[PDB]
Each structure stands twice: as structure tokens, then as C-alpha cells.
Design a protein around this ligand. Sequence first.
Ligand SMILES: OC[C@H]1O[C@H](O)[C@H](O)[C@@H](O)[C@@H]1O
Ligand SMILES: OC[C@H]1O[C@H](O)[C@H](O)[C@@H](O)[C@@H]1O
Ligand SMILES: OC[C@H]1O[C@H](O)[C@H](O)[C@@H](O)[C@@H]1O
Ligand SMILES: OC[C@H]1O[C@H](O)[C@H](O)[C@@H](O)[C@@H]1O
Ligand SMILES: [Mg+2]
Ligand SMILES: [Mg+2]
Ligand SMILES: [Mg+2]
Ligand SMILES: [Mg+2]
Ligand SMILES: [Mn+2]
Ligand SMILES: [Mn+2]
Ligand SMILES: [Mn+2]
Ligand SMILES: [Mn+2]
Lengths: 386, 386, 386, 386
Amino acid sequence: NYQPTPEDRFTFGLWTVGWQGRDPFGDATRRALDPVESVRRLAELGAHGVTFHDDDLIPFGSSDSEREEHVKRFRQALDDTGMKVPMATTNLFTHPVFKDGGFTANDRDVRRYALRKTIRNIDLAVELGAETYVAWGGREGAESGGAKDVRDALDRMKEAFDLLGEYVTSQGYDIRFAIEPKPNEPRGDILLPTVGHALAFIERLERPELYGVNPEVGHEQMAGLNFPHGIAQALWAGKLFHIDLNGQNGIKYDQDLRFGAGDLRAAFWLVDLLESAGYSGPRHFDFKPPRTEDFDGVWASAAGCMRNYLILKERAAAFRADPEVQEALRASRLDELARPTAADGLQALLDDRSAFEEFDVDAAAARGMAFERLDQLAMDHLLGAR
Amino acid sequence: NYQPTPEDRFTFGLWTVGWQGRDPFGDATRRALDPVESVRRLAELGAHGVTFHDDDLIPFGSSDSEREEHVKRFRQALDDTGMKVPMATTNLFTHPVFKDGGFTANDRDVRRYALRKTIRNIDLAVELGAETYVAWGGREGAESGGAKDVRDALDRMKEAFDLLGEYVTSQGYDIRFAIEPKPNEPRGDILLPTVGHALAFIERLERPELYGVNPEVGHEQMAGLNFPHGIAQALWAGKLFHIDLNGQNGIKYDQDLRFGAGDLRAAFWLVDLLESAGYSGPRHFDFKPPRTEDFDGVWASAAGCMRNYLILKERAAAFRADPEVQEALRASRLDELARPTAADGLQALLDDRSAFEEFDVDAAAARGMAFERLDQLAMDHLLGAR
Amino acid sequence: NYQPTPEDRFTFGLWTVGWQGRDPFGDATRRALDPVESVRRLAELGAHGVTFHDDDLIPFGSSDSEREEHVKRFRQALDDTGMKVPMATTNLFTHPVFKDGGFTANDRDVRRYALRKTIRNIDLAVELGAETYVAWGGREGAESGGAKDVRDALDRMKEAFDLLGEYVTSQGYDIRFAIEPKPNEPRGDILLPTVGHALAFIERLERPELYGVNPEVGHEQMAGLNFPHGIAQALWAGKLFHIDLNGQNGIKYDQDLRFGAGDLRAAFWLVDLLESAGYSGPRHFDFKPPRTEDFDGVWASAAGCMRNYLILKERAAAFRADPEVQEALRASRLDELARPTAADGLQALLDDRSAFEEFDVDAAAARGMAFERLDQLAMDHLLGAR
Amino acid sequence: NYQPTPEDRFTFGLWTVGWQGRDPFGDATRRALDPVESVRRLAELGAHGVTFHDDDLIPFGSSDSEREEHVKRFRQALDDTGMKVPMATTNLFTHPVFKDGGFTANDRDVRRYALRKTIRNIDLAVELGAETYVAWGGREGAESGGAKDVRDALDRMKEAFDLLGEYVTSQGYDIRFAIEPKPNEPRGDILLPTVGHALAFIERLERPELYGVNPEVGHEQMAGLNFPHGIAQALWAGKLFHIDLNGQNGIKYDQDLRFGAGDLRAAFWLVDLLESAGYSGPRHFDFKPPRTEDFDGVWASAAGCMRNYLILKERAAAFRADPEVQEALRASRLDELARPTAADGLQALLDDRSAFEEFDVDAAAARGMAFERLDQLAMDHLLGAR
Ligand SMILES: OC[C@H]1O[C@H](O)[C@H](O)[C@@H](O)[C@@H]1O
Ligand SMILES: OC[C@H]1O[C@H](O)[C@H](O)[C@@H](O)[C@@H]1O
Ligand SMILES: OC[C@H]1O[C@H](O)[C@H](O)[C@@H](O)[C@@H]1O
Ligand SMILES: OC[C@H]1O[C@H](O)[C@H](O)[C@@H](O)[C@@H]1O
Ligand SMILES: [Mg+2]
Ligand SMILES: [Mg+2]
Ligand SMILES: [Mg+2]
Ligand SMILES: [Mg+2]
Ligand SMILES: [Mn+2]
Ligand SMILES: [Mn+2]
Ligand SMILES: [Mn+2]
Ligand SMILES: [Mn+2]
């Protein structure tokens, strides 16, 4: 039951199932994985593909010959399995040189280095077939108020993204960029901390059509925000280029639980929205199998990400198809929400006495919205209790 | 010491000092105030002006003759004191008809009513001299996932703001709109929950130049976000049309404490940024004197808002003017953050071996940023301990 | 399916289904309910009983004759339906006199009044059959640091609870007290903010055996705490005298959603624990039907509280009874967690070389805990996807 | 100005200034420090002493000869500087064997190992002069509901603390234990997550007088709780055996900023309370210099912890000594809060008509508490703006 196949477009970062379990208070609990092994094991579970940071696929500091062999072995694993590489990203956070940021480091030489490291990896990502290049500015931010003038930092961040767009255009590449917001951790506060801040920033770039967002479930929940609402705004803007799926229990450190863990009802409404909107990109899991697990638990955790998506997909589709739910949606006026407020135009609205002078405010106020009945139908569908 | 005068541009909502102290668990602890009295008492404290919701100035349901007398008395209080009215707003949240929203109510007749109620008050706001019209969509949102399709709701919200822009343009008014974000409360989640989401939405409106943000200290802090950072992004976008100043202790209900209470260091960095950026709009307090207070405590609380702004203004200016701080800012490379990363252009960056092939990553990583020394100078300045 | 009956011990506060929908930003959306009607409608839904604050059952300020008639009508509704009254409480938060607290008000005359108001209602609660008397100190706390010396306030709170215990002992009553913690709202911070702080305080009372806790799902979640863990500690202490069931979406204002809404997985683990531990008290819902609802939605929301408890009870029981889960629990060493660490005693442990000198730390570290497989079995059971 | 000396009792963990800067997303930015160097540098800054985990002072896995040399060098640094060692603790979190806990690990052999590792270090702590032994159960908890039966885990935690008390009693040691709560991180939820839960647990131990709490500023703030309030409850219980001072910006990952950073007003009210209550234990800083800093920034950050404590101590003492504040405290009835509610006894209260039948509730309700004036005096004192 609920068995994934590559057609479901489920993808995993090499750093997810490859996480060795080091945390701020703990040493590694698992040995490092060869990317080749991760590709094979994920393919056996029904995954569609994998994603990578530059430094996950090629150890930092590798010589050209070593780099060529790493890529060759990875390419052979992709060929052996039929796995794809839909997205890649740059590691601009692990190395100490990035301790104050990459694109917005106060040191200009570090900013130039970060751009060169990214451009090198864009070339590789294109070679491996990626359609999206993600930027997660995890080190862009501050622990103290004097350390970062944010207007200057946003100037530098715009310059960096503009140069990357000039670069991909210069090479004729079709790849597009997706900014992954996060509100905090590892910096005390991170620039572009939410989907909204990232969407707003893109609109000031030179070529905004090249940039979208890669929202992550847990990151918007770390700000206490409603992730399905933020996804709806990204879709409304035409900017949901990619998504990171995982679980998070509220406002605390970034947990990266498997998808479906954390806020289960939010996971249900997310799947409902992605399927209703026809999102066609990768269903990418950015999760960490807990460091309590051995390698068998790693693969059980990855399998559970995909299983939970498929269960929620079934339950959301049953909800929207149920005639009793369709009647409840009309009872709650979701049909009226989708109708224009004033297609008659401004002057007609101003002249419409039923909109003000003769509007019976008390009769309107007395009409219940029937949202609790609708939501209990949604709960009954989610739980299989209809 | 620290005595405000009207030139400091401090303004207060009638609903702030007028709050009677009703909370979700408590009846009123103070009698209602006549707006005329609030104008007089605020003017005596050194305020520049006042702001209003339609229903603060004219009781809901007033006849035309009553409305004319309310406005006449208010105008005479403004004339007697020299107080101004720089901003007004519509109450689209108190009346039960708005229980599911105003501009994004599922009922289309309620959406049309909300627009007509707003347009009536825009006319009054212009008559009283307001330069900004604020929209706080406190009822726009949901407690459950099925109750609001957010893409449809954003369609309705765009339609509403577009019609309001068509209206002000049709009348030749100079007033501009400012959206006030809030993440939650009274709805479980509110649409446009942060500065970023509001900035992003404005960019999809028909006439984006007419709309900016009215961020509130406590609202961004209710999402755990850094308010000075969000203000910097709004300034970077050219969209800080107005601001609401108050205090909040972290992620919990909207406290609306007096400015300077709550997160004191964030208040310091906010004042530093507003003064450095040359923000020229009203310094508006959206606060509630705690319901423990009598009327004398109300005015003490309002006075404390202005006092705390003026103390922080002095301390931030002393910080930025101190030669030892200026040296520390250079030591931490804030000068380098303000320099373009690659004014030499993309090809020059790609050909620059000092940016990659010959970049000494370890030497760069070893350079301390000296941010702790800088931040302790900032603390010493804030505390008057230099 | 999932139909409650009085044997399931579900109870509701009169203030829950009776909530008129006033919030900090909104007027009432529903008319007041007669307690008699609430008793009848709840009984028809399958409830076991109701609970009350003094001022829910008898309007504040009633004369003795009015008080007698209110009680008489309520008693007749209980007799007509077979509903019980297992718990009552005092309203020490709505009236303005309590603006700085009841038992810990700075004014001594208010503290004495609060005690007298409570004692009057203890007598009534006993007359109506209540076994538990709840204290929720919603006004005990502060918005500012100077306003409340907390050691002195805890002295006053101990004095109050000690006097109430002296009173019930003096009358020969069997009723016991349960303190309901909440971290904040309506005060900026509330004294005894969590289950732990309340348990710790009880241990300093004169007669600790008379006092336990009445934890509420949403209140511990407002501090980001794990409600099943806090319930387990209360059960471990022998102090779970009563419980308040509802839903909450994380750290924000007190939402009081219907049970099962909010954090669904936490609701599952709570029901699992209450049923496994054999909790025999009332399953009391302290919830507010959202103000979007009409009276039909009120009863739909109350019905959904009970339905969701019964669904989760079925799924948790199926989880614990499944032989595959029982094998997974052994694989994860939950059996070993329940065995004493050192029943052999201290000297035997000190002399046991297998505990230190010869303990193979690496072999132990390499053993996976298999928690992800266990948790996916739990998810499959909760979702009915086995 | 504000220069610390050893008489101020400021202490630092070796792991604080010794933190190399590894975070969940970043490699080390600083070289490891020799404990001898940290002792010397801290002594030069005016510190009183240092604290240690076993594995900070002696590398894990050291032979007896290596252990003896590590201790010998450390003892010579203490002798050379006059630094003391007032507290020590065990590392039961870094090694992978502790991935599911130490005292509450599901594996019984790990629980026995954790006890033996602790007992070995208690002996060393006593040899070095420590008066307090801290337990921070950072790995005691869970990411999922099935993985840990919390009642069984609390049984195991009680067994462990009881055995440690039996051990110290058996040796005639005077050292006492202090439990350090934390709500989450590194586990999804940690057992005994707050001061209150720890205080409540101690009351169920065999010899409760041997155990107190070691609360940390940032940890209670990670639950959104008011740290001065929790400290007041610990003092009220007689259980403040030790304290960890640092800074935290609200509900997010554990930041461990230097003391005075984070919530400055809470730091002021904490210092006010510690000084007013006459707390005589170490003023211990559990902080991490940010990984942006070099070694000079490490010592600047440590110096700033002590400076900020001394500034706040001066400002709080000036507040409490100011006759205008003393008058404001009487105006707000803080004197009445410290008076018994009913020293006349229960029967006198029941017979006192001024407490109920003749209490003028409206006159009492109308009396303002004057808390805003009091709090602005506190702000003026903190800012040096009187
Ligand atoms: O950008 C790719 C990834 O980089 C890092 O691993 C971040 O922790 C993760 O959130 C992000 O998705
Ligand atoms: O929009 C004007 C005001 O409306 C309401 O009073 C909101 O509570 C407040 O935040 C907002 O500033
Ligand atoms: O104490 C009884 C009840 O009093 C109030 O209604 C509180 O809001 C609620 O949480 C509590 O359960
Ligand atoms: O228990 C001593 C210390 O152990 C660890 O370093 C914890 O991170 C810290 O909070 C605690 O104080
Ligand atoms: Mg991610
Ligand atoms: Mg506001
Ligand atoms: Mg309750
Ligand atoms: Mg600590
Ligand atoms: Mn994440
Ligand atoms: Mn507010
Ligand atoms: Mn509640
Ligand atoms: Mn900490």
C-alpha cells in the first residue's frame, strides 16, 4: 500500500540520508555514506532523484583529477538506477571562511569567493541535468545589531543574485534560481527570513523572472507561520519553483523531521494545496534521520517521508471529491470567495445602495460560516473515520 | 530632560490612550474617553498628532447630523491645540459582520460593504489632512485549513486594494496606503503575516507605487523576527510609509506595551536605523496602557513612549559619533560591506585568480570579525556606561 | 461510528459552548445561552456532565432570591438529563477588581475578597456534587518587573491555598483542589506558568495531599512544551486530578480549539497515555467554538471534541495491541527502560566491571534505537494505513 | 569602571571560552584551548573561578597516567592564579553511546555506565574543591511519542539521583546536586524542561535536601518563560544552589549569548532579585563567544559578561534606594503584597463583613495600580536617565 515510484517525483538531498548525526552537543553516530550507495538505496525505495551541495558530491579541496572521478562514479550510479538530479546548491555555510556570510560577508574578498564557488557548481549542476539551483543563505545575518547594516547587506545580496543571473544568461542555461528562506539558525537572525521576505526581495532583482522560492516546511514553522498559507502566496505569485518537505514541532531549533511528523494537519493541508494547484516540481525531502537511528533506520525514515505524502494525497483527494464536503464548502461560501467582489466596477459599487445604505449588517452578521462542520469532515477524512 | 515637542513627530491612535481595558478574560477597567480630551491631553504631553479608525471618531451607526457634530468637535480640538492627523484607518474587525474578514470575507456582500466603509473614511481622512491610510487586515485569515482558499483570498485582497487605488486616483487625492502586517490574533493565522509577505503582495498590485507598509514592533516580534531587520528591508524597498512603535516580550499574544518596554536592545537598534536612514514619517505609538492603570497611568504610559524614543535617539547618536566606535566598525569591516562586490563586472570576477584559484581561504577564515567588542561598545553607549 | 455516551465521562464548561465570541478585537457574535439549554444540548450529544464558574451559573451581583432560582432551574436540568457536575471553579479574573490578581493582588482587601468569593462557591460546588475544585490564577502575575515581588506573591498564594484547605477540612468535605497552570495571557507572565511549577508549589503547601493539577493541552503548548510529557510527570507524582482537553497551534495566544485540532499527533499520544495509565477522571473540554460559528456550529464543535477523543482512543489501543508494534517496542528497548538500573545496589554497581572498566562503549553506541520504524508504525495506526 | 574582582564570584565553564565554534551547520572557527591557558586568561580578567565537565578537563579515554598529568597541570594553574573550582558536571551528551540518554537511556547498560562515569567525576570534583555538582540531562527525552515512556523514564531518573545521593552520603562529602533544566535541544523535548518541573521532581527524591536547581537564563527563555519569576520560585523553595547566566533572544535554538545580551530588561530584573535575595553562590556564565570571533573576541566577550552584571547591579541598587521609587512602590501597594492576607485566621475572615458583604468592589476596582509610573522609574534607572 502507498508504494512510491519514480513518477511521484520524490527526491532527497545527499546530505539528508547522509547526515552522520553530529549536532551542537554530540559527535557523529553514523559513518559517512558514499553518494553512490545513497543513490542506489534511494532508487530501491522508489525515489525519483537526488540533490546535492557541491561539497557533498566532491570533498572540499579536491584536485581536478579527484573531482573528475567523484563525478564519474556518481554519473554511473545515476545511469545504473535511472535516478535524476533536479536541483543542486552551493555549500556557503560549513567552511569557517563563511562565518559572517557568503554573498553578504562583511569581507569583500569572501563575497567574491562565494560567487566564484557558486558559479563553478552551477556549471556542474547543468551538466548533471538540474533545472533549479537553490540558494540558502544560512550564514547571511547577525547575532548583534551593529555587525550588519541590513540595507547594505541587501545591496550585496542583490548584486550577487544579479551577477548569477547574468552568468546563466551568458551561458544560455535554462536553470532557474530558488531562494530558500529560514528565520534563524545558525545565525541569530537570517536575512530574508520567510517566504514573504524572499518574494519581496526577488521583485527588486534585475531579471525577476529567473528567481523563485524553495520554501521549507520547518523553516516557516520556526517563525510560527502557517506553511500552507505561505505556499499559497508563493503559488499566487507564480514563484513556487521547488519545495523542501519535512516536519517540525513548532518554534524551536530546526528539527528536520521526516515529512508527516511534526504538524500532521499542516502536512495534510499542504498536500491538498500542492495537488489542487497542480504543482509539478520535485517533492524534495530536506530531512535528517534522527541520530538515534542506525543505517536501517535511515532508510526506514526516508521511506516514511514518501509513504506519508502518498497517504495524505489519498485523504486530501477523497476530501475534495466527497459530495458531502462539496456541499459543506458551498454552505461556508467558498464558492463566493472565488467570485470577483466588484466586476461591475468602482462606480457601480459606489452607486450600489445594497452595498452600504441598504445593507442589512445584522442579517449578514447572524449567518454562521459553518467552518467547524467543514473542518470535522476534513478531520474525519484525514483519519479515515468517515 | 528628554522632553518631546511637536517637532519630534510623535503621534498616537485614539484607540491607544482610549483603550478601556477589555481583554479576552476581563471587563473594562476605565471609562471611555472623549476624543477631544485625548487630543488635549496628548498635546499637553508634547505630541504632534493623533490617528483614528472611523469608528473611534464617529460611533458606528451614527446619523449624518451626529457624524457632523463629532467631526466638528474633533476639528475644534485640533485647532485649539495645533495637533495634526497624519494617518487614519478603517475598523474592519470589531463588528460581527467582519467575523470572517472584510476584504477577504467569504461572503461577497461583506467584501463590498468593507470597501464602501473604507472609501467613506478615506474621504474623511483626506478632509482632516491625513497623508497615509492604513489597512490592518486583522480578520483576514482562518482557524482551519478548509475555510479559506488563500490564492482566492489574495485575489480578493488584490481586487480590493486595486479598487481603493482607483478611487484615490479618481479623486486626485495625494494620500497613500500602508499595509500593517500581523501574523496571528484575532485569527489563527492572518494573511500577509509579516513585512516580507506584505512587500511581496504590493508588487502584484496594479499601481504598486501607491502602497507601502506600516510595520509594528510587536507584530514582527510575535513571529520571532528581528524588527530592525524587517524595517531595513522595507527601507531598502522604499516602502516605509509609516511605523507603529510599541513593546512586546517575544512570541505570545499581542501585548502592545509602551515603546521601550519589551525588547529594549531591539528598540535601540530600531531608533538607530530610523535616524540613520532619515525616516521622516510619524513616530506613531500603537500601544495599550495596561488595564491595571487608572487615567493618570494612561498619560504616564504615553509620556514614557516618547521619553524612551528620545533617550534611545541620544544613545544611538552618541554610539555612531564616537571615534572609538567608528574605529571598531572599520575593524569589523562594515566599510567593506558597503563596497560593491564586483564593480569590475562578471568577466573580471571570473578571470580574477585572487577570487578563487589563489584565494587563501585559511588566512581569511582566521581573521576575527571583532563583533563582540563592537557590541559591548553599543551596550556601554545604551547604558550610559562609557 | 464513534458515538459518545455518558460512560465516556466527557464534560464541558458552561463557558465553552456558552462563549459569545467576544475577543480582544471583536464584539460578540452569538447570543448568551441559558445554562439550562446548554445542559440539555450537551446531554443530547452524549456528554456526561458540565462544569461552571460561580459567575457563569449565577450572574455577578445576584440577590439571594435570584441565586436560589438560578440554582433551582439548573438542578432541574441536571435531573431531567442525568448530567453530573464533577468540577467547579471561581471567576477571579473578569471583574475589574481582579485586575492585579485575586489571591496575589497587591491590595490585601482584594485578596480577602477573592478568598471569600471562592469559599462561597466551594459550598455550592459541594451541594451540586463536584469532586474537584479548580483554581486558575489567570490574573496572578505581571507585565513589568517592579509590580510584583514573586516571593511575596508565592507567600500569598500559599496562604490562600492553605486557608482553602483548612476550610474544606473544617466542613468535612471530600472535594480536592486542582491548580490549572497557564504561562501568560491575560497577564504578561502568569505565576505557576506550567505543570512543573504548579507541582513544585503544591509540595510547599500545608496539606499537599489535597491539591493536584488541572493541566490544559493548549496552555502547556503556549510554552512550546510537550503536553503528554507534562501529563506523564503529573501522573508520576500522583497529581492528575482533572484535565482540560482542547487544541492549540503552537506558541501564540490561547486558541482553545476543539480537541483534536491543533497538534493532532500530540492528541494521539495524550490519549494513548491517559488510557494506558488508567486515568479515571473527567475528560473535560475547555474549548471555544470559533466566533465564525452560529449555534449549530457550536454543537458541531462540541460533538467533534468527543468524536476525536474516541477515534484517537481506538487508534492508540490498536497500536499498543498490534504484535508488530509490540515487537518494535522490544527492538527499541522500551522493556529495558522499565527495568531498574541497579536493583543490585550501589556497591554492586561500583564493583561491576561490565559497567565501566570492561564496558564496550563503541558496541553500545553502534546499536540503532529503531525509533523511526516504531514511529512510522504509530503514524500508520493513527492514519488507518496498516 | 565596573571592573570585576574575584570577590564578585564570577565563574566560567572551561567549555565556554573554550568553545571552538562548531555548530550544526559549521566547522570549528577557533583552535582548542588548553584549560591552563583559560584559567590564566580568566584570572587576568578578574574571574573568581572555573567549572568543568569531566571530558573538558581530561580527554575522553585517557589512561590513568594521562589523567594524573592533566589534573596536575590544572591544579598548578589554580595555584598560580588563586582561581577556585566551585562546581563540576559530567558530560553525558557528546559521546554517541548517550544518543538516547544517560540516566534515562532505554538501554540499561548505558544507564549503569552513565552512573559510573558521574561517580568517577564526583570524586574528582570534591578533590578540586567543588561545592555543587550539576546534572544537565540534555539527552534525556525524545523526538517521537513511542520512544520514551515518560513515567518509566522518571522512575529511572529518580533511581539515578537517589544512587548519587547514597554515594555522596556514603563518602561523607558535603557536595550538593543541582539539576539544570532545558526544554528542548538536542532532543526534541527534554525531560524536566523547566525550573518548575525540576523543583517538582526533587520533591520525590529520597533525600530532597541534597538537590536544588541550576537554572539558565536562556533555557527558561527558550520556553518563553520569565526567568526572574522562575528564579523567585526557586528561591522561595530554598533551592537556588547555582545559576547559569547568559543571553537569549526569545524562543529559538539555544544561543548562549554573553550575559546582558538578549533580553536586557530581564537581565536587570534578575540582578535586582539576586542582589535583593542575597544569593551567595557563584555568578556562573554558561555562554559561547560567537564563532565570528577570534581569540581576542573570546576574552572581550567574557569580560562583557562580568561588566554587564556589574552595571546592572549598580542600576538596580540605585532603583531600590531612590526615595522616589520607594514612594512609588508604596503607591503601587508592594508593601501590602508583603503583608499576610488573613493573619486573623479563617473564622475571622469568614465573619468579616468588610471582606464580602460590605466590600465596595467598585471603589477597589477604580484604584489605579500606578505600575506604569513605577516601571518608567525602573527604565530611567536602567538607562541612567534620571
Ligand atoms: O540549500 C540546500 C540546503 O542547505 C542546507 O543543507 C540547509 O540546512 C537546508 O535547509 C537547505 O535546503
Ligand atoms: O490599523 C490601525 C490599528 O487597527 C487595530 O487597532 C490594530 O489592533 C492595530 O495594530 C492597528 O495599528
Ligand atoms: O478554571 C476554569 C477556567 O477558567 C477560565 O475560563 C480559563 O480561561 C480556563 O482556562 C479555565 O479552565
Ligand atoms: O551542565 C553543564 C553544561 O553542560 C552543557 O555544556 C550544557 O550545554 C550547558 O547548558 C550546561 O550548563
Ligand atoms: Mg532546506
Ligand atoms: Mg498597529
Ligand atoms: Mg482551562
Ligand atoms: Mg547551562
Ligand atoms: Mn531545516
Ligand atoms: Mn499590536
Ligand atoms: Mn486555554
Ligand atoms: Mn544554553
